[PDB]
From Swiss-Prot, chain A:
Residues of the full protein shown: 803 to 852 of 1273
Site residues by UniProt (Cleavage): 13-14
Species, as recorded: Severe acute respiratory syndrome coronavirus 2 (2019-nCoV)
Region of interest: Fusion peptide 1: 14-35
Annotated spans, Fusion peptide 2: 33-50
Top-rank taxon, per record: Viruses
Disulphide bonds in the chain: 38-49
Role summary: Precursor of the fusion protein processed in the biosynthesis of the S protein and the formation of virus particle. Mediates fusion of the virion and cellular membranes by functioning as a class I viral fusion protein. Contains two viral fusion peptides that are unmasked after cleavage. The S2/S2' cleavage occurs during virus entry at the cell membrane by host TMPRSS2 or during endocytosis by host CSTL.
Record's protein name: Spike protein S2
Region entry Disordered, spans: 26-50
Gene it is expressed from: S
Length: 50, 98, 49
C-alpha cells in the first residue's frame, strides 16, 4: 500500500513518491506557470522573470 | 514598487535597468523587454505538404497578439496571430493545429 | 561640558555588502578579517554547509 498508487490523491503518485517529491527543493525559481507572471505583474522581481 | 526617495535607478542581478522614476510624472515605470516569447515551428515535412503550425513558448493564448507583431508584420504572418485552431498547452499557446 | 568623539582610520579593503528587500544595507562581511568571513566573501554567501 505504501508503493502502490491510491485513488485518494488527484495524482497517481504513491506515498513514497509523494515523499520524494516534497524532499526536492530548488535554489532557483521553480518551473510553475512562470510566464503567467512577469506580464502585468507588479512584483516582477524574481529569478525566473529575469 | 516601493521606491526610496534618495534613489533614481533600479537594477536587477544582471545589472540591467529594471525600474526608473520619470522626472515629470512621479510613477514607477518598469523597463522590460517588450512582451517577448519563444517561437518553434512544427511541420510534417516539406516532402509531404506545406502546411505548418507555430508553437509559442509558455505564453497564454490571450496576450499572444500583444506579444507578437500583430500591428507590424505581414498578413501571412498575421494569420498565425489568432484563428480558430487555437489550443492552450502547458508548454504554451499553439496556433495552427486542431 | 560633557562630550566625546571617536577617530578611526580607513584602509583599502574588500567588503561583501548585503542588501535587504527594502534596499538598505543590513550587514557586511570583511573579506580580510578572519578565515570564516574570508570564506564567506569568496563563496559570496553570508551563511556555508
Ligand atoms: C514639470 O515637472 C514637474 C516635476 O515633477 C511636474 O510635477 C510637472 O507636472 C511638470 N510640468 C509640465 C507642464 O510638464
Ligand atoms: C493564462 O493561462 C493560465 C493557465 O491556463 C490561466 O490560469 C490564466 O487564467 C490565463 N490568464 C488569462 C489572462 O487568460
Ligand atoms: C521594509 O519596508 C516596509 C514598508 O515600509 C516596512 O513595513 C518594514 O518594516 C521594512 N523592513 C523590513 C525588514 O521588512
Amino acid at each position: 500500500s505504501q508503493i502502490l498508487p491510491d485513488p485518494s490523491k488527484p495524482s497517481k503518485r504513491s506515498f513514497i513518491e509523494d515523499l520524494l517529491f516534497n524532499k526536492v527543493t530548488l535554489a532557483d525559481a521553480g518551473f510553475i506557470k512562470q510566464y503567467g507572471d512577469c506580464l502585468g505583474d507588479i512584483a516582477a522581481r524574481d529569478l525566473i522573470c529575469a | 514598487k516601493k521606491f526610496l526617495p534618495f534613489q533614481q535607478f533600479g537594477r536587477d542581478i544582471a545589472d540591467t535597468t529594471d525600474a526608473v522614476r520619470d522626472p515629470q510624472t512621479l510613477e514607477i515605470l518598469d523597463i522590460t523587454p517588450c512582451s517577448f516569447g519563444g517561437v518553434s515551428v512544427i511541420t510534417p515535412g516539406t516532402n509531404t505538404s506545406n502546411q505548418v503550425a507555430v508553437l509559442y513558448q509558455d505564453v497564454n493564448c490571450t496576450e499572444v497578439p500583444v506579444a507578437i507583431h500583430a500591428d507590424q508584420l505581414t498578413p501571412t504572418w498575421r494569420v498565425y496571430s489568432t484563428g480558430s485552431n487555437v489550443f492552450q498547452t502547458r508548454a504554451g499557446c499553439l496556433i495552427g493545429a486542431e | 561640558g560633557a562630550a566625546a568623539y571617536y577617530v578611526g582610520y580607513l584602509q583599502p579593503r574588500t567588503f561583501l555588502l548585503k542588501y535587504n528587500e527594502n534596499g538598505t544595507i543590513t550587514d557586511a562581511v570583511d573579506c580580510a578579517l578572519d578565515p570564516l568571513s574570508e570564506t564567506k566573501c569568496t563563496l559570496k554567501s553570508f551563511t556555508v554547509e
